[PDB]
Ligand binder design. Structure first.
Ligand code: JUJ
Ligand code: ZN
Length: 328
C-alpha cells in the first residue's frame, strides 16, 4: 500500500531530469527528419503525433527514448501472411517504386536505405546514442484490417461513439518479419489516446475529486516486469516479455472494470493486484489476446516458450506472496 506509492514517487523524481533531455532528443529528430525529406523516397516522412518521443518500453530507464517516423504513402493494399493476423505484404494501387520487388514492397530494401541515410548523418530500424530507437511506419488511411473487427472492446468503458471515432483514424505498418518482407500492424497512436483519455467520465483526472489510479497501475506493472527482467537478465526465460504485454493485459482489465469507481485512487493496492491477477491468468493459460487483434495470441507457444511463461508466473507469484521485494 504505502510501498506502492513510494515506488511511484521514485519514478516521478526520475522523470524530471529528462525534461531538458527531451529537447536534446527532439533536436536530433527534427534534423534527421529534414535530411530524410531530401531523399526522394522519404518525402512524406514525419513524426507520429501527440509527442515526439513515446518514452520507450522502460519506465525505469529515462535514458532511452523511442520515436516513430510515419511515412505517408499512396493507397495501400494488403495481403495477409500465412494466416498470421498481424503480418502483411504491402502492395500499391510514386517514388517508392525503387523498393518494389514485383508487386510486394520490400521492407528490407526500404530499411537498408533508411539506415544508410541516417548512418551518413526492423522493429527499431536504427538505434542512436542515452539511446534512441527509431521505427519506420507506413501510414494507411484505409479501413482497419478485418482482423481488428472484434478488437478494441471499449464500448462499455469508453463508449461505442469513441470506438467508432477511433477506428476512423489511420493505422500503421512497421517492417517486422515473421519471411523477411512482411509488415506488422501498429496502433501506438490509439493506445496513447486511450491512456491519456482513460475514464468513463470525460473529466477523469481533470479535478481532484476524479483522480483514478489507472495510470499508476500501468506504471507499477511496467516497473514490476522491468525489475524482474533486469534481475533475471542472465537466465533468458524473460527475454520475450516486454511492456507491450503488460500494457495489453492492462487494457483488458480496463475493459473488464469499466467504471471509474473501480479505479479509486485509495484502492491502488487492490487495483494493482487486479492487474497482477489478470496477468497471471494470461500466463497460466498462455492466452494474451492483442487488444486490437483478438486472434493474435501474444502468449502462444509460437512466440514465447511455455517454460518462459511458467518462469515468469513463478516469479510474479513469488513477488505477490512476499509483498513485492523487487520494489524496495
Ligand atoms: N512476437 C510479437 C509480439 C508482439 C507483436 C505485436 C502485434 C501487434 Cl498486432 C501489434 Cl499491434 C503490436 N504492437 C507492438 C507489438 C505488436 C510488439 N512490440 C514490442 O514488443 C515492444 O518491444 C511493439 C509494439 C507481434 N509479434
Ligand atoms: Zn483518471
Amino acid at each position: 500500500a504505502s510501498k506502492l506509492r513510494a515506488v511511484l514517487e521514485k519514478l516521478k523524481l526520475s522523470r524530471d531530469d529528462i525534461s531538458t533531455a527531451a529537447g536534446m532528443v527532439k533536436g536530433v529528430v527534427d534534423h534527421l527528419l529534414l535530411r530524410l525529406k531530401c531523399d526522394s523516397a522519404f518525402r512524406g516522412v514525419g513524426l507520429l503525433n501527440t509527442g515526439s518521443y513515446y518514452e520507450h518500453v522502460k519506465i525505469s530507464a529515462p535514458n532511452e527514448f523511442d520515436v516513430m517516423f510515419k511515412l505517408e504513402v499512396p493507397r495501400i493494399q494488403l495481403e495477409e501472411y500465412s494466416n498470421t493476423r498481424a503480418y502483411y505484404f504491402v502492395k500499391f494501387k510514386n517514388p517508392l517504386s525503387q523498393f518494389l520487388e514485383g508487386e510486394i514492397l520490400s521492407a528490407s530494401k526500404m530499411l537498408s536505405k533508411f539506415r544508410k541515410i541516417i548512418k551518413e548523418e526492423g522493429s527499431p530500424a536504427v538505434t542512436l546514442l542515452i539511446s534512441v530507437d527509431i521505427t519506420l511506419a507506413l501510414e494507411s488511411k484505409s479501413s482497419w484490417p478485418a482482423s481488428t473487427q472484434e478488437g478494441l472492446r471499449i464500448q462499455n468503458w469508453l463508449s461505442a461513439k469513441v470506438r467508432k471515432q477511433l477506428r476512423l483514424k489511420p493505422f500503421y505498418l512497421v517492417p517486422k518479419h515473421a519471411q523477411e518482407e512482411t509488415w506488422r500492424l501498429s496502433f501506438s497512436h490509439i493506445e496513447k489516446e486511450i491512456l491519456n483519455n482513460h475514464g468513463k467520465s470525460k473529466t477523469c483526472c481533470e479535478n481532484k475529486e476524479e483522480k483514478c489510479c489507472r495510470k499508476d497501475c500501468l506504471k507499477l506493472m511496467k516497473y514490476l516486469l522491468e525489475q524482474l527482467k533486469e534481475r533475471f537478465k542472465d537466465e533468458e526465460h524473460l527475454d520475450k516479455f516486454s511492456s507491450y504485454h503488460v500494457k495489453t493485459a492492462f487494457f483488458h482489465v480496463c475493459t473488464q472494470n469499466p467504471q471509474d469507481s473501480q479505479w479509486d485512487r485509495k484502492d491502488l493496492g487492490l487495483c494493482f493486484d487486479n492487474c497482477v491477477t489478470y496477468f497471471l491468468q494470461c500466463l497460466r493459460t498462455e492466452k494474451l489476446e492483442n487488444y486490437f487483434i483478438p486472434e493474435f495470441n501474444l502468449f502462444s507457444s509460437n512466440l514465447i516458450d511455455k517454460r518462459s511463461k511458467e518462469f515468469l508466473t513463478k516469479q510474479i507469484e513469488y513477488e505477490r506472496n512476499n509483498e513485492f521485494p523487487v520494489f524496495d
